Write a protein that holds these residues in place. Structure first.
Motif, short mmCIF file in Angstrom:
data_model
loop_
_atom_site.label_atom_id
_atom_site.label_comp_id
_atom_site.label_asym_id
_atom_site.label_seq_id
_atom_site.Cartn_x
_atom_site.Cartn_y
_atom_site.Cartn_z
N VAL A 197 0.84 -1.18 0.00
CA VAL A 197 0.00 0.00 0.00
C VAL A 197 0.88 1.24 0.00
O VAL A 197 1.91 1.29 0.69
CB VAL A 197 -0.90 -0.03 1.29
CG1 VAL A 197 -1.72 1.25 1.37
CG2 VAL A 197 -1.80 -1.25 1.29
N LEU A 198 0.51 2.23 -0.76
CA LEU A 198 1.22 3.52 -0.72
C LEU A 198 1.47 4.08 0.66
O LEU A 198 0.56 4.10 1.51
CB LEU A 198 0.42 4.55 -1.53
CG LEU A 198 0.33 4.28 -3.02
CD1 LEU A 198 -0.75 5.11 -3.63
CD2 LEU A 198 1.73 4.70 -3.71
N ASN A 199 2.71 4.52 0.91
CA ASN A 199 3.18 5.08 2.16
C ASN A 199 3.50 4.09 3.26
O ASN A 199 3.76 4.51 4.37
CB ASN A 199 2.14 6.12 2.74
CG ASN A 199 2.78 7.16 3.62
OD1 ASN A 199 3.99 7.54 3.41
ND2 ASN A 199 2.04 7.61 4.64
N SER A 222 -7.08 8.20 5.03
CA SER A 222 -6.72 9.63 5.05
C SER A 222 -5.27 9.78 5.44
O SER A 222 -4.66 8.89 6.02
CB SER A 222 -7.58 10.47 6.00
OG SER A 222 -7.63 9.86 7.28
N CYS A 223 -4.78 10.98 5.21
CA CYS A 223 -3.34 11.27 5.44
C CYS A 223 -3.27 12.28 6.51
O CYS A 223 -3.96 13.30 6.42
CB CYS A 223 -2.82 11.84 4.17
SG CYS A 223 -1.02 12.11 4.29
N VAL A 264 1.21 10.24 7.87
CA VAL A 264 0.80 8.87 8.08
C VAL A 264 -0.53 8.58 7.39
O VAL A 264 -1.33 9.46 7.28
CB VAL A 264 0.72 8.53 9.59
CG1 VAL A 264 2.05 8.84 10.31
CG2 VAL A 264 -0.37 9.34 10.33
N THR A 265 -0.73 7.31 6.93
CA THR A 265 -1.95 6.95 6.33
C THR A 265 -2.73 6.19 7.36
O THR A 265 -2.21 5.28 8.01
CB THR A 265 -1.65 6.06 5.13
OG1 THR A 265 -0.80 6.81 4.27
CG2 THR A 265 -2.96 5.76 4.32
N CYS A 300 0.83 11.62 1.58
CA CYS A 300 0.99 10.19 1.89
C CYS A 300 1.13 9.37 0.55
O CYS A 300 0.78 8.20 0.51
CB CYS A 300 -0.22 9.68 2.68
SG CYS A 300 -0.20 10.28 4.39
N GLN A 301 1.63 10.04 -0.48
CA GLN A 301 1.97 9.46 -1.81
C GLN A 301 0.71 9.05 -2.57
O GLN A 301 0.80 8.26 -3.52
CB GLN A 301 2.89 8.23 -1.66
CG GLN A 301 4.16 8.71 -0.95
CD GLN A 301 5.12 7.65 -0.59
OE1 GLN A 301 5.26 6.65 -1.29
NE2 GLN A 301 5.87 7.88 0.53
N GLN A 302 -0.43 9.60 -2.20
CA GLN A 302 -1.64 9.23 -2.89
C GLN A 302 -1.78 10.12 -4.13
O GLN A 302 -1.38 11.27 -4.12
CB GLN A 302 -2.83 9.35 -1.98
CG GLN A 302 -2.67 8.40 -0.80
CD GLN A 302 -3.81 8.62 0.22
OE1 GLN A 302 -4.71 9.41 -0.04
NE2 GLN A 302 -3.76 7.92 1.34
N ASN A 303 -2.40 9.59 -5.16
CA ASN A 303 -2.48 10.39 -6.39
C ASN A 303 -3.73 11.28 -6.33
O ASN A 303 -4.72 11.04 -7.02
CB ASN A 303 -2.58 9.42 -7.53
CG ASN A 303 -2.76 10.12 -8.89
OD1 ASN A 303 -2.62 11.37 -9.02
ND2 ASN A 303 -2.99 9.30 -9.91
N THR A 304 -3.68 12.35 -5.55
CA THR A 304 -4.84 13.29 -5.45
C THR A 304 -4.77 14.33 -6.58
O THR A 304 -5.68 15.11 -6.78
CB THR A 304 -4.78 14.06 -4.11
OG1 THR A 304 -3.59 14.89 -4.11
CG2 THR A 304 -4.77 13.10 -2.91
N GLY A 305 -3.64 14.38 -7.27
CA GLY A 305 -3.43 15.47 -8.25
C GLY A 305 -2.68 16.67 -7.64
O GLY A 305 -2.06 17.44 -8.36
#
Length: 135
Positions: A43-45, A61-62, A74-75, A124-129
């Protein structure tokens, strides 16, 4: 008044994502959002992961946490049902809650945070844009 405690669970790369109460959100938090991770390690992060209470935090959430002059992103990957409590991976906690070489939080096993607040998932390295920047 956020507390953090540590638990090896959240840096156990081998665990099925089914073992976490955020398993559905985790399935979407692989580096391909279509191909679920099957294990926490994918999982990312990973492994800057925490359990945190429902309602106060959303699955996936981050959150930016501060202890003294340290911070981490943190995720949320699981739930604890104690208000204002994060439970994080061992190394995450050890690093966040060490002050000038003293592993205060890790050695005691519970540390109080200076602050915790949610930030954009890109932190948290998520691709939110969006770019994480300096929240």
């Amino acid at each position: 008044n956020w507390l953090i405690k540590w638990d090896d669970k959240f840096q156990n790369d081998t665990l099925s994502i089914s073992e976490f109460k955020c398993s559905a959100a985790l399935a979407k938090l692989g580096p391909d959002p279509k191909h679920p991770p099957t294990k926490l390690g994918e999982v990312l992060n990973f492994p800057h992961f925490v359990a945190a209470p429902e309602a106060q935090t959303e699955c996936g959430s981050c959150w930016k946490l501060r202890y003294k002059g340290n911070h981490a992103f943190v995720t949320v990957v699981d739930r604890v049902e104690e208000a204002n409590l994060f439970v994080g991976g061992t190394d995450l906690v050890k690093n966040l809650t060490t002050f000038n070489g003293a592993p205060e939080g890790y050695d005691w096993g519970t540390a109080q945070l200076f602050s915790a607040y949610q930030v954009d998932g890109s932190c948290c390295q998520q691709n939110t844009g969006k770019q994480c920047g300096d929240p």
